[PDB]
Amino acid sequence: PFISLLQGDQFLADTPIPGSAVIPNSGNLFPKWADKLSPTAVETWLFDAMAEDGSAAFTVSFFRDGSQAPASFRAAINAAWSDGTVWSQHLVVPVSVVTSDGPDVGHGHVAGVWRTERTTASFDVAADLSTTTVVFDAPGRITGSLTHRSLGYPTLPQSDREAEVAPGAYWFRPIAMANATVDLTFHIDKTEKRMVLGPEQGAFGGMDRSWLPMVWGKEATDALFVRAQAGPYVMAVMRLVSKPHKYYQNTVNAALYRDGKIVSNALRSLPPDRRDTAATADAVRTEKLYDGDGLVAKYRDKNVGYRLEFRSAGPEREKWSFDLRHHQAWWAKPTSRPGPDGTGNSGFVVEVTGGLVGSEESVHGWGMTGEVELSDGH
Numbered sequence: 001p002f003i004s005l006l007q008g009d010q011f012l013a014d015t016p017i018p019g020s021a022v023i024p025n026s027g028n029l030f031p032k033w034a035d036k037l038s039p040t041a042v043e044t045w046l047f048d049a050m051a052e053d054g055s056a057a058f059t060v061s062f063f064r065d066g067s068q069a070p071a072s073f074r075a076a077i078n079a080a081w082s083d084g085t086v087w088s089q090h091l092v093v094p095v096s097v098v099t100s101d102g103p104d105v106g107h108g109h110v111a112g113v114w115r116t117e118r119t120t121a122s123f124d125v126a127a128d129l130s131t132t133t134v135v136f137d138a139p140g141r142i143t144g145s146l147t148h149r150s151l152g153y154p155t156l157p158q159s160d161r162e163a164e165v166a167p168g169a170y171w172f173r174p175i176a177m178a179n180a181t182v183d184l185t186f187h188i189d190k191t192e193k194r195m196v197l198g199p200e201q202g203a204f205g206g207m208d209r210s211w212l213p214m215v216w217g218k219e220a221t222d223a224l225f226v227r228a229q230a231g232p233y234v235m236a237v238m239r240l241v242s243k244p245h246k247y248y249q250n251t252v253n254a255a256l257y258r259d260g261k262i263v264s265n266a267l268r269s270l271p272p273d274r275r276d277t278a279a280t281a282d283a284v285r286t287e288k289l290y291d292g293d294g295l296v297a298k299y300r301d302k303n304v305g306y307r308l309e310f311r312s313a314g315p316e317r318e319k320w321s322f323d324l325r326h327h328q329a330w331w332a333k334p335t336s337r338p339g340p341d342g343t344g345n346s347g348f349v350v351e352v353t354g355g356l357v358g359s360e361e362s363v364h365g366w367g368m369t370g371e372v373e374l375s376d377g378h
């Protein structure tokens with residue numbers, strides 16, 4: 001069994017060391033810093049779920065973050081209920097272990113455990129990526145499980161370029177789209193609250209995988225996470241805008257599906273003020289929305305949502321445009337000291353409208369966005 005076990009107080013490398021390479025056509029779920037963790041690296045395993053009607057949403061990111069040592073191991077959890085309740089906590093643990101069962105380190109049954117030597121948070125992913133299980137055992141905070149049943153959407157990167165969300169930085173989706181179940185109990189500051197999404201309620205989610213050998217905050221001014229479903233469309237986005245020292249490089253790893261077929265493999269992020277028909281490659285344009293309905297974000301950008309315009313370089317030259325409008329404020333935290341330069345990290349449940357450009361299509365759905373703002377820097 002391949003084992004990456006990070007524990008104690010000597011798990012950090014002395015210098016930034018390289019991580020292992022991208023494995024083509026793989027979830028890449030086994031850690032890229034297997035034995036020692038680079039002090040500037042971050043590895044992320046993300047699992048989420050939301051109700052098909054936006055009545056509930058849940059996301060957890062399992063982190064190994066070298067830069068925030070000693071507290072490098074963390075399951076960051078966010079939960080939202082349609083009645084307005086939100087719940088956000090980190091489970092900071094001293095042990096993070098990931099194992100992959102089988103001879104092939106890129107295609108084995110993976111189990112991750114963020115745990116004390118009481119807090120247990122664990123994930124389990126089938127070797128064929130068909131299913132996941134996430135289990136929380138954190139008495140007095142969160143207990144229960146999340147599961148994914150993959151819908152089998154094409155998703156895996158076939159090359160280093162397809163795994164990138166920016167040069168040398170990786171974010172992609174080992175499971176693009178899954179039927180999600182949730183059966184969780186949260187302790188609200190002693191009161192308990194349930195979140196239950198059964199296997200036939202149309203709740204959906206995915207599994208995202210990321211790793212970076214550099215601290216990403218020093219490289220970006222903007223990060224946008226999206227997962228949304230509207231009618232036949234499923235869309236997932238990780239878009240980065242760099243710092244001004246790289247001239248606001250616009251990068252993305254995104255995908256649009258229609259009835260489970262990938263219709264935009266969007267590894268190109270377009271200038272937000274374009275709305276043209278050029279398409280030499282599949283692409284997505286992310287544009288902050290300020291007009292119309294939607295809760296206004298609180299920090300640097302007072303946006304009511306985001307427009308996502310996907311383009312296909314396929315022969316039909318289709319474009320799809322969706323408006324993702326802030327429906328429920330999920331989380332909101334500063335990413336800098338307050339004031340005129342202040343920035344933030346905001347999560348929303350979004351209402352989704354739109355469809356194929358040039359058609360009568362007008363679909364309706366729900367999703368989540370994570371909208372991160374970072375300082376422009378000296």
Ligand SMILES: C/C=C(\C)[C@H]1C=C[C@H]2C[C@@H](C)C[C@@H](C)[C@@H]2[C@H]1/C(O)=C1\C(=O)N[C@@H](C[C@](C)(O)C(=O)O)C1=O
Pocket residue numbers: 044046059060061076077078088089165169171210212216223224225331345347370371372
């Ligand atoms: C929901 C997903 C995101 C908000 C990601 C957004 C952009 C990513 C950039 C990428 C390169 C690294 C990765 C770690 C970031 C990810 C990130 O910033 C996360 C994430 O995965 N979970 C949250 C955790 C959160 C809200 O900050 C918290 O609960 O404290 C969070 O802020």
